[PDB]
Amino acid sequence: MIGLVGKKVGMTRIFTEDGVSIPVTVIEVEANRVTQVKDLANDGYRAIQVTTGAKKANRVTKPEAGHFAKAGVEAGRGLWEFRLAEGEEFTVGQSISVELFADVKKVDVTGTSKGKGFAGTVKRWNFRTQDATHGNSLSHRVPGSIGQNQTPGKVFKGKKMAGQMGNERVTVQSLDVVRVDAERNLLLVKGAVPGATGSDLIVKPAVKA
Amino acid sequence: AVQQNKPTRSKRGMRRSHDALTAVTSLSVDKTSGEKHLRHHITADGYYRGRKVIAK
């Protein structure tokens, strides 16, 4: 089916009355509201468009302010889309709540990760560090040899090297949900989800079973 | 760790393409003295947002 846009509030624990203290993640999903329903007649596919949150009216722009005033929904931060599964007919303006997770067991969180900046080859790819002494001369963390010789004569494409780590969209699937509270519009999922406390993230039900 | 062939006037000139300098494009005028200062800077005379705050 479809998933739901939310925001990470941080991680907490939950003690159960038998023992175990599961680590949960706090996700404040708002009332997600549909602004555009796409269908295969004049769009080539069927999907839905969803905004959430709230937006400064002096910080919403005239090409985008009209995009909500044609939907008749209230301007939220950012737009997202979801591929429908051929049995889920919605309409433009139906505010989808957190009641769809009334019987979902493992949701698949997709969000962005915390940026490491320019990483080194030891952090980014777990290259083992060379010897710190026995004469090793200004080489204590270098990536070492990168190729072979004259016969391949070049650097193979796809070589793990230094560069950017983090700041990437990442999916984690099969994370068990433990609370679907609807008065506070909260969601408590096992384990850790992609980082940056306060950043948006897309929850989706499990493809894998 | 050295060049093997002398590069040209083109490869010299094309590397210099982004090494040109920008422009200020706008000089904000102040209320009182009417002087052209930088945006968010005090004037060379001393005023800022129409006030001799510095008493220079």
């Binding site: 003690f15 023992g19 175990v20 203290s21 | -």
Partner: protein, 122 residues
Amino acid sequence: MIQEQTMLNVADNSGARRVMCIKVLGGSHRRYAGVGDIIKITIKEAIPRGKVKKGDVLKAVVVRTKKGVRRPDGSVIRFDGNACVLLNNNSEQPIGTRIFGPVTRELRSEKFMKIISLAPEV
């Protein structure tokens, strides 16, 4: 977090005094062994009578560790000496009569029911 060359204190009246781990079992490239695990050891110190000689290679199981176990609540039991018992190399069924000091409850693996029984505490 017991590993190669780790000196351990024996935890039964078998004749050992001080044993060194030489191999952790159960998996290729395997690093540290915790409390549930079986390691191959040697004998670096012995009791004169004993049941073992100095320089015997045989199997052991860590019963106490300085790194400590973690309960289902997150409560960690940290000891002060990395201790273990001896096992008869083939079909283990431990070598010994008594157990000294406290063992932890993660030795309930149904083949260490003897080590549960002979231990005084926990």
